[PDB]
Amino acid sequence: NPTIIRARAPLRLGLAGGGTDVAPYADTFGGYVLNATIDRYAYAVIKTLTIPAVRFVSTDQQVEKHQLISEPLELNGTLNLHKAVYNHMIRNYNHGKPIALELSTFCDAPAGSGLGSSSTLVVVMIKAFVELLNLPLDDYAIAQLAYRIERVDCGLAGGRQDQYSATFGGFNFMEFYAAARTIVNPLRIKNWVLCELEASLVLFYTGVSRESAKIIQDQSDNVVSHKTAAIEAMHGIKREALVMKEALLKGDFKAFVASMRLGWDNKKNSARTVSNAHIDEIYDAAIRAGAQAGKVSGAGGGGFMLFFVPTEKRMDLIRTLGEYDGQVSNCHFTKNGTQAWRIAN
Amino acid sequence: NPTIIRARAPLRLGLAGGGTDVAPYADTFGGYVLNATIDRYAYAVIKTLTIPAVRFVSTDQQVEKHQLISEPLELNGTLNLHKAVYNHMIRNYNHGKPIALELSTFCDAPAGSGLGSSSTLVVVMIKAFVELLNLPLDDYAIAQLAYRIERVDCGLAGGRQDQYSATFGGFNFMEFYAAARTIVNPLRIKNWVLCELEASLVLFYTGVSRESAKIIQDQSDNVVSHKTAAIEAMHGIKREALVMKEALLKGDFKAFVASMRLGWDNKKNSARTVSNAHIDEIYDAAIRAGAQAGKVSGAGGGGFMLFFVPTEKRMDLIRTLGEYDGQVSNCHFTKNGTQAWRIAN
Ligand SMILES: Nc1ncnc2c1ncn2[C@@H]1O[C@H](COP(=O)(O)OP(=O)(O)NP(=O)(O)O)[C@@H](O)[C@H]1O
Ligand SMILES: Nc1ncnc2c1ncn2[C@@H]1O[C@H](COP(=O)(O)OP(=O)(O)NP(=O)(O)O)[C@@H](O)[C@H]1O
Ligand SMILES: [Cl-]
Ligand SMILES: [Cl-]
Ligand SMILES: [Cl-]
Ligand SMILES: [Cl-]
Ligand SMILES: [Mg+2]
Ligand SMILES: [Mg+2]
């Protein structure tokens, strides 16, 4: 009787505030991020095995297989996230006795796409074990656990917003404090506002960013080394996230676009590689085609861009982007957080 | 006090049965179609004007402007659908007195994409007038009206499935009879089945089909001219749509894929240009990459293809398709039918 479980968690568009969730900034001044989940998913699958082994498979089809032993798996640099989730679950919920299983992942967008894929993948792996082991972990616990596994257990530097979008789902405004304290504010946005927003957003995939780690390091350095102007850009990122949140609650699209423009300027000034000449060319083309505001979705340097465009200019913008390197798509938001289902047993 | 209304209606994936909804077949034997709406939309906007004129704007940015006169607009071959919707509403709900307004449309996929864009656009224009005039038209009435406007008023040959997906939303199994009698069967599919299905579907945009009219004409000719083998292919299309419907209700994915394979064979045999060498090359590549079944979504000859692929082979299939001409995407279903909202007054 093999058991087969799948879980999924939606990826996310960073709307405002990204950068203020980097460790030194959040811990010192408090960070704010406004984000929203979209119709693209990370997935994890658990299949119990009929042989004494553990198998890990990743999105880019890396594979590791081990013999069933009663010591933690070493985090040797290959598939550390899968191993660390596995180690945590075995130690904390199965009294340290290994379980014969294959843990596999796949994702609707590769890492560096600006959709929060890395942390979303950690979240979905945890969710799959929550279903397999029937664990009483609520959304806060899963998001806090995903954070621990990635940033502490696997020692990976990064932000704090992606764990929460992946778990809770929908539009959320997050407040980040010291000692890993995060408050999630679910935003119940009016239906008309959501329809108007999707009607006015165009996404543009520019390719994989290879700048995220560098951007996060530079943003962290801003605070640690007291780079005054760059810190002030970050305070601007924080301020505009709150402005945007209130604009969405009031259905004030004029304020929404003005806060995105100021936010994008602030984000570019916070780190040298957030934008580059190639990204600025697209941005400028989008503006003269009729977009009113835009930004890179994730840390920066590539991945998805999003543009706000009035409906009368929408098709013009879509045609213009067709002439650049990348893929255009509409933007559809999802309300559901991470979900699991069973296929066998 | 200008009034601004927007409406949207979701586009659709043809899952099974397409072709049996062509006029001679449906009227003679009864047609069946299984389809489901996706996360891509057609839109219409109505703005009342402060000058005595009527303006029409289309998705590909064609524009017509007329003086406010008290006779129906001529269907001269430019923007006939917009004009005919306008004429109908003025004659039937405004006692024949013209209304000064701009009616504009735009769409997340161009015609020939295989997503039912043409009829979906007619539906959304009607919905916008339903909101502007506060009309008591339910979903059946809007779908029957969209059919009348396109196929009778504008004399355009085509199918019957798209008007119903655009209006009702979700997964529907439609039964088509003579005298324009259609029964919509909403399918309440289990959540796990829907998640499993989205996890197993990959979409692939091959470019605009220019075969739809020819395919529909050939399918119609099959019946009118008694082409025995080609009629029998169509009976197979019909049969497999019912099989697929029952497979989705039972969560039987083995039967689902077998009915899609038989359906695709039957569809190709119903009309010479449903597939071609270019489409078959993609299909074959998808199969050897691990897809278990696939098809062209609309009438055929191009547009979106969909593939069912087991989750363990999903990323392999995605990588393989990356090497062909077209765009890959995930498949996310929507439950909502056509919706309208107000921006001013
Ligand atoms: N200095 C660093 N060294 C090594 N890895 C890092 C460093 N900083 C961040 N990372 C990690 O690199 C991984 C890839 O992240 P990234 O390229 O941002 O793709 P993503 O997960 O799609 N998020 P984003 O694209 O920014 O929305 C994440 O797990 C980060 O935690
Ligand atoms: N013989 C014909 N002559 C002129 N127009 C036709 C004929 N047959 C069909 N049409 C119309 O051509 C238009 C374009 O349809 P089509 O290329 O199928 O794009 P679509 O609306 O995206 N549907 P599909 O792509 O098949 O899902 C529709 O309004 C049809 O009604
Ligand atoms: Cl972000
Ligand atoms: Cl952001
Ligand atoms: Cl179809
Ligand atoms: Cl079909
Ligand atoms: Mg990403
Ligand atoms: Mg189409």
Author numbering:
A (entry chain A), B (entry chain A): 2 to 346
Quoted passage from the original study:
Here, we present the structure of WcbL from Burkholderia pseudomallei. We report that WcbL operates through a sequential ordered Bi-Bi mechanism, loading the heptose first and then ATP. The protein forms a head-to-tail dimer, with the two active sites facing away from the dimer interface, in line with the native molecular weight predicted from size-exclusion chromatography.
Repeated attempts to soak or co-crystallize the substrates M7P and ATP failed. The ATP analog appears to form a network of interactions with the enzyme, with the majority of interactions formed with the phosphate, and the ribose O2 and O3 hydroxyls. The phosphates interact with the side chains of R13 and D163, while the ribose ring interacts with the side chains of S118 and S119. Superimposing the locations of AMP-PNP and mannose shows that the location of these molecules is compatible. Indeed, the reactive atoms (O1 of mannose, Pγ of AMP-PNP) are located in positions compatible with the expected reaction (nucleophilic attack of O1 on the γ-phosphate).
